[PDB]
Amino acid sequence: REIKIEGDLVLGGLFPINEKRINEDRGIQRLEAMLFAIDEINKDDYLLPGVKLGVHILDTCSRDTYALEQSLEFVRASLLIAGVIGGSYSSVSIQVANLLRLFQIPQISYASTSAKLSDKSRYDYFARTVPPDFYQAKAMAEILRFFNWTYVSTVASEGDYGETGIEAFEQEARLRNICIATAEKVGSYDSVIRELLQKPNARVVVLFMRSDDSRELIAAASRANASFTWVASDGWGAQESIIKGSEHVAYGAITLELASQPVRQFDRYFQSLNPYNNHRNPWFRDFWEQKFQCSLRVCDKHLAIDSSNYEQESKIMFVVNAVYAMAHALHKMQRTLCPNTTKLCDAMKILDGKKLYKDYLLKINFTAPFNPNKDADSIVKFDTFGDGMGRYNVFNFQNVGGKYSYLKVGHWAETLSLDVNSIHWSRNSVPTSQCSDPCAPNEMKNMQPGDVCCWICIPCEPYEYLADEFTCMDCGSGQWPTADLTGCYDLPEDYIRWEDAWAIGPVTIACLGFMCTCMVVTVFIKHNNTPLVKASGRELCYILLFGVGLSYCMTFFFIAKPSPVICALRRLGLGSSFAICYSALLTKTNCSSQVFICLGLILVQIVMVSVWLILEAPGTRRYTLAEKRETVILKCNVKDSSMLISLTYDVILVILCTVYAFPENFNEAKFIGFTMYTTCIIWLAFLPIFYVTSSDYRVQTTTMCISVSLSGFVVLGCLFAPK
Amino acid sequence: REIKIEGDLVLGGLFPINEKRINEDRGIQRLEAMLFAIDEINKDDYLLPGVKLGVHILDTCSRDTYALEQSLEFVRASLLIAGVIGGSYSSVSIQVANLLRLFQIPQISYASTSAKLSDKSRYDYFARTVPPDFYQAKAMAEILRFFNWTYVSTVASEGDYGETGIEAFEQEARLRNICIATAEKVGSYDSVIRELLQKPNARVVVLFMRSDDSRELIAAASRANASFTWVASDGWGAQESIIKGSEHVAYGAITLELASQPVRQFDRYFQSLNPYNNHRNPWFRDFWEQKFQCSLRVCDKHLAIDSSNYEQESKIMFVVNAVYAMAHALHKMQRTLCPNTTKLCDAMKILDGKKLYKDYLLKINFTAPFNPNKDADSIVKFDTFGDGMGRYNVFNFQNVGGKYSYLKVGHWAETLSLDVNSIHWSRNSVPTSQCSDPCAPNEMKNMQPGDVCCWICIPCEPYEYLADEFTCMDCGSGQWPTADLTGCYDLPEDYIRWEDAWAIGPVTIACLGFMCTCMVVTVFIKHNNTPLVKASGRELCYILLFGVGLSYCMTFFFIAKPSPVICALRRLGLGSSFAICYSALLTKTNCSSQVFICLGLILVQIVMVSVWLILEAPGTRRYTLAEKRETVILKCNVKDSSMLISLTYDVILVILCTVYAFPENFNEAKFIGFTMYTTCIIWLAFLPIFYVTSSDYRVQTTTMCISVSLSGFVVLGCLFAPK
Ligand SMILES: N[C@](CC1c2ccccc2Oc2ccccc21)(C(=O)O)[C@H]1C[C@@H]1C(=O)O
Ligand SMILES: N[C@](CC1c2ccccc2Oc2ccccc21)(C(=O)O)[C@H]1C[C@@H]1C(=O)O
Ligand SMILES: *[C@@H]1O[C@H](CO)[C@@H](O)[C@H](O)[C@H]1NC(C)=O
Ligand SMILES: *[C@@H]1O[C@H](CO)[C@@H](O)[C@H](O)[C@H]1NC(C)=O
């Protein structure tokens, strides 16, 4: 059975008014709204005056292979058609787009929200007046980056709602760094809430599921006493038969629903339908015996459609709207292609469908009817694909005192414009659900435990530099870390001795070793004919006057600064105070006389080249040293053995003065025999005092300054009796 | 009008037997072959015995919107159908795949080669028995990489043959490095051969065009006398009405055609069709009055279908083949789904089309009929998309002597298997058409002039290293290039002097300067009480004996090797032979006497520290030098001014001996007065001899060796009279 009424040019409709029983909520509630919407068009002079509209609507029986064998009665007049209206479901309007494409006919579906239907290179005569469902992974990914929740755990639903919603959620999740944790797919029952506790720092579940497979979750997560704050897509909606099981666990969620003001005058029409004043609809004499349970038992004559039984559908403002889309596009045809006329012209029999849909239906813009406060949001655009503007609502769940009941807290069209005083989630909080907060460069060794987007960031070493965001290494041996831990610094070395409370030492030692060396110059070179310059020698003792000041200044050319040529001189300077100041004064004391000078130099230069022998490979180097990771010193190329090789090898010479001090016994054991060991105690007792030191400050000069203080009167103290 | 004959289950066909006149070549020649192919199936007991086949074929009128309004007579029995055969064109079998998909019916097209029809997620009931045209950019890109032609210039054709062939040629061109040059698109006439001469190192044109827009090219490139060797796709084919205009310019091309042996017994059938023994076909009584020009003028009773007028079509082995595809798939149905029977069982009324095409039609494999030497290439596979195996032919154009006529030189199925003795292109050549051949690393500076794939490669510098394939830089100052020009080498420096035909010089100079210094030791230190050691001094002249050998060996510690401490000694060694060997022998010659020694040292050490003064900042360095890009020397840190500062500043001392040589006139001007300038001539005359040199080999010692030869007898030659 079907219904067709003629006219100037007619429309066509499909409507699910059978079930695989009359579908009394999604069926007749919609179909009798279209026939109301026609009867305003044929009685409004500001609309199409002469184009008297009729209709030819069928019964799509909610199954695809009954639509096709029904839809051919449209196309078998090419009772002509100008465009079908309506494919209600989303599998029944994908098999009358693959057969109304092939005959150049526009198709306007009033409810069918899916995502494949906007693939306009495959369904190129299809424009609908509901938003698709790639615009619900663009609210629940913009009321997550408004509350700064960045670690969620989503659960889909199996079939064709979830797998094209969630795979459109992740691709709008990476665009705001909102990175998910766990993605289960319910087709089990208690396991999907078992896996949703193993990440307990994720307190927001994005719930993208149907309206039947989101009772068995909530009735399971009330049978385990857990709690969350859910965001959920249109499967929840405002349907108040999803919380009547467990009115406590679902408290505090926020969800979305398609916004639609009810149409006012339609309730003043549809509540005046008695089945004796409706001789037009061939289903009204079978719907009336189903929502009243009669059999026209026996029907009552006083029965009517009151306001206690006819709460109208959510989607009625998407039929009365989306038949005015056709009755304004086809108003532009008769007033442009054939002007100066009212009736259908002769150029209307070739009803160019391809020129209709692609030119001046898809680019139309007009206010909605039956709405007060016009041009607020009541304009019906179409985008560049055939999908109307998405205007949602955000429903919160404020349990005000007595009964758990829903509430509206704002909406969005392109910018989420909430009212920020309904967050009633756990007790009163903004339940952040963000893991492992960003941290300071002091703890910049951020390493993740295997799961992405939250980590541990620990302080690595104070001698280390932050190499990367997830890597740090040491700034370097001889490179000290600065605050800019990417490129840190070098390390300041240490060799300073310019008055380190010790450099005044050799100055006063020169004031006692070299200043009293002029007292040697006051007597010893002042008498070269005295009996003191006789075979009891004093012209020999100019070589003690030469070493009177060089021994008083040996560390004066060592303790300044280890510059690699300058410190090599004092490396080569230990031998001069080993032979010509000590051993030359330890060779002439065997007591010829006329040739008594040359016998000394025959034994003096036996070690003058041996200092160059140890200077063969090592020498003229001032390499640096560092032990405790922040303490660095600048020293010389000298081992402890080689430092002993200058110390304990030249201290063997005291064995060459033990018996050698004691046929020339005369007045020489009293004074020059006295200093054979009492000057050597500065070398005997000071052997292990270098073995202990490592800073080497006072021992840097006490191997010289006490010994040269002995040298101020080794023989000149006994030569102080005359003059 | 149409034709339907009943049966157990029937097939359906579309055939272009009208033109937008009966299409007597592509029409009735094909349609009457299908009805022949049926009448062997209903009379072959090894085939389907009880399934008596009938047919119901229509007239697709070569236009899309006449196929659809014709094709609904198939689908209005769901006179039932089991699968349509045939969509002939390639726009008429893309509008009976978008309407036979929607009702689960397989479709087999016998000729329709295109590329969109293998998009089997959009046309999912479509299997054809011709190869598509993504398998003709896979022969003409494999008989280009067999003759090693790698630089071509292709010309497409506008519409839907070229733009889906050439855009499938480039994507099979980059896979073998065969890179194209110019891609014009003919929709002008003479300009497309104007642009095909501006790259005259491209002698092969890939010609991917139709059969009408490839006469206007050849009839233009004969009106400009040019020449090429063409490869061309199936637009040429073997059609001998494309060369009859210009039988000389097109000589030597090679082209492709779909291989099809003619069907033998069909010519023994179709040549027995009189229009009184054919009471079945409702077009045969209008085709007969068109290929005989009669009007059944007046027809002749003796007229018949002879062998002089019925040269059969190329594509008849693709209909008699591709109706046996259905009559072997549907043989497997009746012998599996309902075995132990011959007739159609009760489970045949639900003819499961989706279970038919996707399971055991697309995976079928069977020999072709009416062909001798079976199983050579006569098996009919289907690939994983619904496209048969591509088996072409490669036609060459050997002009044998008298007439230009085509010839077959081999074929390919998956491997191009030619016969390599037909290359008859210009005179007799393999016309390589490859630009700017690869070259040696000696010329590895390969830079392209703007056009890709051919370049110029030039030799860059012999002191340069090949950095990249298109970049070279210098190997380095102090880095010599090797043959491995990626990482070349360092450069060997030059400081060698170990017997460079000059080191024996100072050895013999020591044999005359230091060996005769022992002759000074033979007399001068052998008498310290003689009148020669008196106030006429000789104990002073030990300082001439000291400098007797050090002047004989000053370059002996300079000309060895410039090691940076060792050469610094000879840098510090010029002063000793400037004062104590020369100026100390130029200070005592003012003639006290008892203190005559200390007056000399008061003036001797006036320049002993001035050598350290110029050694303040510069010194102990041995930096290297190089001028002519392959010649490097190792020298010392010495400028020409500083080398003069050791030379011309110490040569001022001759002005301190001019008047100073001449109250002590005695016997001293004869010998020691003689050497005041005749030793200075070794310093006077040798001032500019350093200003010229840069190799410094003989002048490295002649500033010493002649002067020390004077020093062998400066005073000892006059002290040679006694002893
Ligand atoms: N357009 C809907 C949307 C629908 C849907 C809506 C909410 C929850 C589950 C659900 O199941 C799917 C699955 C795929 C595509 C669309 C949906 C339809 O039924 O197709 C529905 C408004 C139409 C009506 O029933 O009036
Ligand atoms: N299948 C063909 C192939 C055809 C074609 C072949 C050669 C040159 C030009 C040309 O034009 C196009 C353009 C697009 C797709 C196919 C073609 C057809 O006519 O469609 C032709 C074998 C069918 C027949 O005519 O019997
Ligand atoms: C993060 O979101 C909260 C939610 O109220 C907001 O107040 C806050 O300003 C956001 N953070 C920053 C750094 O802006
Ligand atoms: C390039 O192609 C020619 C064509 O005859 C072939 O003989 C030759 O071997 C090919 N080049 C190489 C390097 O194989």
Coordinates of C-alpha atoms in Angstrom, one line a residue, chain B residues 305-612:
Chain B
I305 CA 28.4 -15.0 -47.0
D306 CA 31.5 -16.0 -48.8
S307 CA 35.2 -15.7 -47.7
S308 CA 35.6 -12.5 -49.7
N309 CA 33.4 -10.3 -47.4
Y310 CA 33.4 -11.8 -43.9
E311 CA 36.9 -11.4 -42.4
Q312 CA 36.1 -12.0 -38.8
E313 CA 36.6 -9.8 -35.9
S314 CA 39.7 -9.6 -33.7
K315 CA 37.7 -10.1 -30.5
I316 CA 35.7 -13.3 -31.1
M317 CA 37.9 -15.5 -29.1
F318 CA 36.9 -13.2 -26.1
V319 CA 33.2 -14.0 -26.4
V320 CA 33.3 -17.8 -27.0
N321 CA 35.9 -17.9 -24.3
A322 CA 34.0 -15.6 -21.8
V323 CA 30.7 -17.4 -22.0
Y324 CA 32.5 -20.7 -21.2
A325 CA 33.5 -18.9 -18.0
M326 CA 29.9 -19.0 -16.9
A327 CA 29.2 -22.5 -18.2
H328 CA 32.0 -24.0 -16.2
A329 CA 31.3 -22.1 -12.9
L330 CA 27.7 -23.1 -13.1
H331 CA 28.8 -26.6 -13.9
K332 CA 30.6 -26.7 -10.5
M333 CA 27.4 -25.5 -8.8
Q334 CA 25.2 -28.3 -9.9
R335 CA 27.9 -30.9 -9.2
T336 CA 28.7 -29.7 -5.7
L337 CA 25.7 -28.0 -4.1
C338 CA 23.3 -30.7 -5.4
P339 CA 25.1 -33.9 -6.4
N340 CA 23.8 -37.3 -7.4
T341 CA 21.5 -35.5 -9.9
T342 CA 21.5 -34.0 -13.4
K343 CA 18.6 -31.6 -13.4
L344 CA 18.4 -28.3 -11.4
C345 CA 17.7 -29.2 -7.8
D346 CA 15.3 -27.5 -5.4
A347 CA 18.2 -25.5 -3.9
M348 CA 18.7 -23.8 -7.3
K349 CA 15.8 -21.3 -7.0
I350 CA 17.8 -19.3 -4.4
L351 CA 20.6 -18.7 -6.9
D352 CA 23.2 -17.3 -4.5
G353 CA 25.0 -14.7 -6.6
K354 CA 27.3 -13.5 -3.9
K355 CA 28.3 -17.1 -3.1
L356 CA 28.7 -17.6 -6.9
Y357 CA 31.1 -14.9 -7.9
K358 CA 33.2 -14.7 -4.8
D359 CA 33.8 -18.4 -4.3
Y360 CA 34.0 -20.6 -7.5
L361 CA 33.8 -18.4 -10.6
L362 CA 36.7 -16.1 -9.8
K363 CA 38.9 -19.1 -8.8
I364 CA 38.3 -21.2 -11.9
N365 CA 40.8 -22.6 -14.3
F366 CA 40.0 -24.5 -17.5
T367 CA 41.4 -24.9 -21.0
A368 CA 40.1 -23.0 -23.9
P369 CA 38.0 -24.7 -26.6
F370 CA 38.6 -24.8 -30.3
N371 CA 42.3 -24.6 -30.1
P372 CA 44.9 -27.3 -31.1
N373 CA 48.0 -27.9 -29.0
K374 CA 46.2 -27.6 -25.7
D375 CA 47.6 -26.2 -22.5
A376 CA 50.2 -24.0 -24.2
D377 CA 48.6 -20.6 -23.4
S378 CA 45.0 -21.5 -23.8
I379 CA 44.0 -21.5 -20.1
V380 CA 41.7 -18.9 -18.8
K381 CA 42.7 -17.7 -15.4
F382 CA 41.3 -14.8 -13.4
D383 CA 43.5 -12.8 -11.2
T384 CA 42.6 -11.6 -7.7
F385 CA 40.6 -8.7 -9.2
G386 CA 38.7 -10.1 -12.2
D387 CA 41.1 -9.5 -15.0
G388 CA 42.4 -12.2 -17.3
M389 CA 46.0 -12.9 -18.2
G390 CA 47.6 -10.4 -20.5
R391 CA 49.2 -11.9 -23.6
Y392 CA 50.2 -9.4 -26.3
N393 CA 52.1 -9.3 -29.5
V394 CA 55.0 -7.0 -30.6
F395 CA 54.6 -6.0 -34.2
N396 CA 57.6 -4.6 -36.1
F397 CA 57.5 -2.8 -39.4
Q398 CA 60.1 -4.6 -41.7
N399 CA 59.7 -3.0 -45.1
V400 CA 60.7 -6.0 -47.1
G401 CA 61.7 -4.6 -50.5
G402 CA 58.5 -3.7 -52.3
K403 CA 55.7 -2.9 -49.9
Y404 CA 55.7 -1.6 -46.4
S405 CA 53.8 -4.3 -44.5
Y406 CA 53.7 -5.4 -40.9
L407 CA 55.5 -8.3 -39.3
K408 CA 55.5 -10.3 -36.0
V409 CA 58.7 -10.4 -34.0
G410 CA 57.6 -12.0 -30.7
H411 CA 55.4 -11.3 -27.8
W412 CA 55.3 -11.3 -24.0
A413 CA 53.2 -12.7 -21.2
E414 CA 55.4 -12.0 -18.2
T415 CA 58.8 -11.9 -19.8
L416 CA 59.5 -10.1 -23.0
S417 CA 60.7 -12.8 -25.3
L418 CA 61.5 -11.1 -28.6
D419 CA 63.6 -12.1 -31.6
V420 CA 66.5 -9.6 -31.5
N421 CA 67.1 -9.4 -35.3
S422 CA 64.5 -6.7 -36.2
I423 CA 65.8 -3.2 -35.3
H424 CA 65.2 -1.7 -38.7
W425 CA 65.1 1.9 -37.4
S426 CA 67.3 4.4 -39.2
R427 CA 69.6 2.4 -41.4
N428 CA 70.6 -0.5 -39.2
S429 CA 71.2 0.5 -35.5
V430 CA 70.2 0.2 -31.9
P431 CA 69.3 3.9 -31.6
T432 CA 70.5 4.3 -28.0
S433 CA 69.0 7.8 -27.3
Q434 CA 70.8 8.0 -24.0
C435 CA 72.3 11.4 -22.9
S436 CA 75.5 12.1 -21.1
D437 CA 77.0 8.7 -20.3
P438 CA 78.5 7.9 -16.8
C439 CA 82.1 8.9 -16.5
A440 CA 85.3 8.4 -14.5
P441 CA 86.2 9.7 -11.0
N442 CA 88.8 11.9 -12.8
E443 CA 86.0 13.9 -14.3
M444 CA 83.8 13.6 -11.2
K445 CA 82.2 17.1 -10.9
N446 CA 78.9 16.0 -12.4
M447 CA 76.6 19.0 -12.7
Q448 CA 73.3 19.1 -14.6
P449 CA 72.4 22.0 -16.9
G450 CA 68.9 22.3 -15.5
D451 CA 67.3 19.2 -17.2
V452 CA 67.3 16.0 -15.1
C453 CA 69.1 12.7 -16.0
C454 CA 71.8 14.1 -18.2
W455 CA 74.5 16.4 -17.1
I456 CA 78.1 17.4 -17.8
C457 CA 80.9 15.8 -15.7
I458 CA 84.2 17.8 -15.8
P459 CA 87.5 17.2 -14.1
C460 CA 87.9 19.5 -11.1
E461 CA 91.3 20.3 -9.5
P462 CA 94.1 17.8 -9.0
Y463 CA 94.6 19.4 -5.6
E464 CA 90.8 18.8 -5.0
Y465 CA 89.0 15.8 -3.5
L466 CA 85.6 14.4 -4.7
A467 CA 83.3 15.4 -1.9
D468 CA 80.0 14.2 -3.2
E469 CA 78.7 12.8 -6.5
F470 CA 77.8 16.4 -7.5
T471 CA 80.3 18.2 -5.3
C472 CA 84.1 18.4 -5.0
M473 CA 86.3 20.6 -2.7
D474 CA 90.0 20.8 -2.0
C475 CA 91.6 18.0 -0.1
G476 CA 93.3 20.6 2.1
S477 CA 96.2 22.8 2.8
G478 CA 98.6 20.2 4.1
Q479 CA 96.5 17.4 2.8
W480 CA 97.4 15.8 -0.5
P481 CA 94.8 14.1 -2.7
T482 CA 94.9 10.4 -3.2
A483 CA 93.0 8.1 -5.7
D484 CA 90.3 7.5 -3.1
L485 CA 89.0 11.1 -3.6
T486 CA 86.3 10.7 -0.9
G487 CA 88.8 10.6 1.9
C488 CA 92.1 11.5 0.3
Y489 CA 95.2 11.8 2.5
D490 CA 97.4 14.2 4.4
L491 CA 100.4 15.9 2.8
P492 CA 104.0 14.7 3.4
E493 CA 106.1 17.7 4.6
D494 CA 109.8 18.4 3.8
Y495 CA 112.6 19.0 6.3
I496 CA 115.0 16.3 5.4
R497 CA 118.8 17.0 5.5
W498 CA 120.4 13.6 6.3
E499 CA 123.0 13.7 3.5
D500 CA 121.1 15.8 0.9
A501 CA 124.5 16.1 -0.9
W502 CA 125.3 18.8 1.7
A503 CA 125.7 17.3 5.2
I504 CA 129.2 16.0 4.4
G505 CA 130.1 19.7 4.2
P506 CA 130.2 20.5 7.9
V507 CA 131.8 17.1 8.6
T508 CA 134.8 18.2 6.6
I509 CA 134.5 21.7 8.0
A510 CA 134.7 20.1 11.4
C511 CA 137.7 18.2 10.0
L512 CA 139.2 21.7 9.3
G513 CA 137.7 23.9 12.0
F514 CA 137.6 21.5 14.9
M515 CA 140.4 19.2 13.9
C516 CA 142.8 22.1 13.6
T517 CA 141.4 23.4 16.8
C518 CA 143.4 20.6 18.4
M519 CA 146.4 22.2 16.7
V520 CA 145.5 25.3 18.8
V521 CA 145.4 22.8 21.7
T522 CA 148.8 21.6 20.6
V523 CA 150.7 24.9 21.2
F524 CA 148.6 27.5 23.0
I525 CA 147.8 25.5 26.1
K526 CA 151.3 23.9 26.0
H527 CA 153.2 27.0 27.2
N528 CA 151.8 29.1 30.1
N529 CA 155.2 30.6 30.9
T530 CA 156.4 31.6 27.4
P531 CA 156.9 35.2 26.3
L532 CA 153.9 34.5 24.0
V533 CA 151.6 34.3 27.0
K534 CA 152.8 37.7 28.3
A535 CA 151.1 41.1 28.1
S536 CA 151.1 40.1 24.4
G537 CA 148.2 37.9 25.5
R538 CA 147.6 34.2 25.0
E539 CA 145.7 33.2 28.2
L540 CA 143.1 35.6 26.9
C541 CA 143.2 33.5 23.7
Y542 CA 141.7 30.4 25.3
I543 CA 138.4 32.2 24.5
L544 CA 139.5 32.0 20.8
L545 CA 140.2 28.3 21.4
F546 CA 136.7 27.9 22.9
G547 CA 135.2 29.5 19.7
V548 CA 137.6 27.6 17.5
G549 CA 135.2 24.6 17.5
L550 CA 131.8 26.1 18.3
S551 CA 132.1 28.4 15.3
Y552 CA 133.1 25.2 13.5
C553 CA 129.9 23.6 14.7
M554 CA 127.3 26.4 14.9
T555 CA 125.4 25.0 11.9
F556 CA 126.1 21.5 13.2
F557 CA 123.4 22.2 15.8
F558 CA 121.3 24.0 13.2
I559 CA 121.3 22.0 10.0
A560 CA 120.2 18.7 11.5
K561 CA 116.4 18.9 11.9
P562 CA 114.1 21.8 13.1
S563 CA 112.6 20.0 16.1
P564 CA 110.9 22.8 18.0
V565 CA 113.2 22.8 21.1
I566 CA 116.3 21.8 19.2
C567 CA 116.0 24.5 16.5
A568 CA 115.2 27.0 19.3
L569 CA 118.7 26.4 20.6
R570 CA 120.3 27.5 17.4
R571 CA 117.8 30.4 17.4
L572 CA 119.4 31.2 20.7
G573 CA 122.8 30.2 19.4
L574 CA 123.7 33.1 17.1
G575 CA 124.8 35.4 20.0
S576 CA 127.6 33.1 21.2
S577 CA 129.4 33.4 17.9
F578 CA 128.4 37.1 17.9
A579 CA 130.2 38.0 21.2
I580 CA 132.6 35.5 22.7
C581 CA 134.0 34.4 19.4
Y582 CA 134.0 37.7 17.6
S583 CA 133.2 40.7 19.8
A584 CA 135.3 39.4 22.7
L585 CA 138.0 39.2 20.2
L586 CA 136.9 42.7 19.2
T587 CA 137.0 44.3 22.6
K588 CA 140.4 43.4 24.1
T589 CA 142.1 45.0 21.0
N590 CA 141.9 48.6 22.3
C591 CA 145.7 48.3 22.7
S592 CA 144.9 47.8 32.7
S593 CA 146.9 44.5 32.6
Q594 CA 146.5 42.8 35.9
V595 CA 142.7 43.2 35.8
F596 CA 142.6 43.1 32.0
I597 CA 140.1 40.2 32.0
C598 CA 137.1 41.8 33.7
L599 CA 136.9 44.8 31.4
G600 CA 135.8 42.5 28.6
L601 CA 133.0 40.8 30.4
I602 CA 131.6 44.3 31.3
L603 CA 131.0 44.7 27.6
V604 CA 130.4 41.1 26.7
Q605 CA 127.1 40.5 28.4
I606 CA 125.4 43.6 26.9
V607 CA 123.7 41.4 24.2
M608 CA 123.6 38.1 26.1
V609 CA 120.1 39.1 27.3
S610 CA 119.1 41.0 24.1
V611 CA 118.8 37.6 22.4
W612 CA 116.3 36.8 25.1

